[model samples]
Target: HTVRAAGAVLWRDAATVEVAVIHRPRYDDWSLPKGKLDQGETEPVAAAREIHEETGHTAVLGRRLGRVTYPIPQGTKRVWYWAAKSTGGDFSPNDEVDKLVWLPVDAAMDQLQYPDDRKVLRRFVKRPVDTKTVLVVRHGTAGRRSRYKGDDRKRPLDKRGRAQAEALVAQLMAFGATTLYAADRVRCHQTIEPLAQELDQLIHNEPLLTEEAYAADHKAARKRLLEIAGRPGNPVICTQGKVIPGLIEWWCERAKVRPETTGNRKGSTWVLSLSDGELVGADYLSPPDEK
Candidate 1:
């Protein structure tokens, strides 16, 4: 009765922001490029994958644009949409699609054949397309503090945490995560180790992101995070539980938005969207399976 899918309002900044609309041969309709979920794929991961396949461009995912549902022959199909920025590719004729065009928002709206796609594009236009995406991850679970005889800073990820870290490699990079940063603790670094290996990037240690360091000097920690967010490659940082909630809540307050939620489960992520060095949107991704 239900089918799940994901797509992007695939866009780029030209003279004005342009979004991609495609022509389907059989349907004879123009719509946003999207595809059904591959087994075990997260919606965000599926969004990036479909964008690349349909548009021949790598998609750097931004904020979620919510979902659109419409009637299908079997029943209903619901597609999750993201505001994704496109990079580097050329369209070649494909099986389902033969034409691709990038047009201004209104022009694309005019050309699109479906109201659902127009709805997704409308949401994309509400947010700036060029926002910086900074991923803030809570470190994967480590051995309980009381159970570990060693210094807590030296404690590493438990088995379940290691699997969670492996699961993150695709999901985090789906949002264009390239640079890796972690608190100056074994658990934090281990949480992102697989990602660093995948990207062949070094982990930059941030003492300021640790719980103790944040407690001692919150101002500096906040400042350093903004500095990192300003850097290119849509950086990913892993911090402890205590550090994430307080730092995020503080940023939300400064951004003048009531946080929808600040939950920080182990291996969870916050996709912080910043427009011109200010927080504009925040989206949460739940932790991937571990235990």
Candidate 2:
């Protein structure tokens, strides 16, 4: 059996990028904030929860820092990590963590006791901090296209899609989604509706991101995607499969980077890490309640 855990390389932009390292009183070890996933919890959600619980700082999770595995009493322990931007919080002496300190990457690399955390830090510092994150999402599965009677644009998500949408709220929010937009299609809007309601923000309609709009003029939709990425705060643009691949291809070509994986499953997300409007990395997150 394996114990699965997730954590964050919590970072903040100050004089320079400062990373947080916590001292575990029990283990007498300095390490990243992390813990085992609770029953039925997703990795991102568990990382967000544990980051706050252990270090008292809420993290706006960013790009993946990859996974590290080691043998444990559980047989093996697998831990996934992400670069998280710390908004700000005060640390209290707790049983789990006696002290939490934010240090420069150089200092933190020396401060961290484990090679795994130092390796993750090297992965983090290799990239620029203060990155702008954008989320491209395929709308949750509605139903078979042939079964819908009304205009295809008016189609809505089926029962399972609602569950998928509900599950997506936590996953999406973990990255600190500050703005929300959905394609004009009803299914796309409904697919992102749960997240909108969670943040109590208006769903800014993105007509150009729709399949029809993208099909009519690829360059225009492509331009609009960049505009959304330029906006302040992370924006979640809920679109569809047909529109995503072309956008992804165009983006990768412009960014001069190749995607490790191209996934377009309904309800999945493509997290784009951008530095000053240039794509640096891309990661795919499956729907939290994936079977």
- Please list the Cα RMSD from the true structure of every candidate, rounded to 1 decimal place: 2.8, 2.4
Candidate 1 global lDDT: 0.85
**Leading candidate by lDDT:** 2
Candidate 2 stretches with Cα past 4 Å from truth are: 147-151, 258-261
> What 10-residue stretch in candidate 2 is worst by lDDT?
146-155
Clashing pairs in 2: none
Residue-level lDDT of model 2, residues 1-291, one tens digit each, is 889899989988752688889998788999999889887677888999999998888878888777799999869898888898887888899787998888999999899999998998898887766678899989898888866543398779999898888888988889888899999989988988888899999899988887878889988999999999998989999998889988988898988866655678998888888998889778777766662
Residues 66-184 of candidate 1 have per-residue lDDT tens digits of 77898899798989888888878999977778899989998998999788888878878876768778899998878688665433888889999998899889889888888999999
lDDT of 2: 0.86
- Candidate 1 regions exceeding 4 Å error are 71-76, 147-151, 257-262
Q: Alpha carbon lDDT of residue 84, candidate 1? A: 86
Listed in order, each prediction's TM-score against the native is: 0.87, 0.90
**All models: lDDT?**
0.85, 0.86
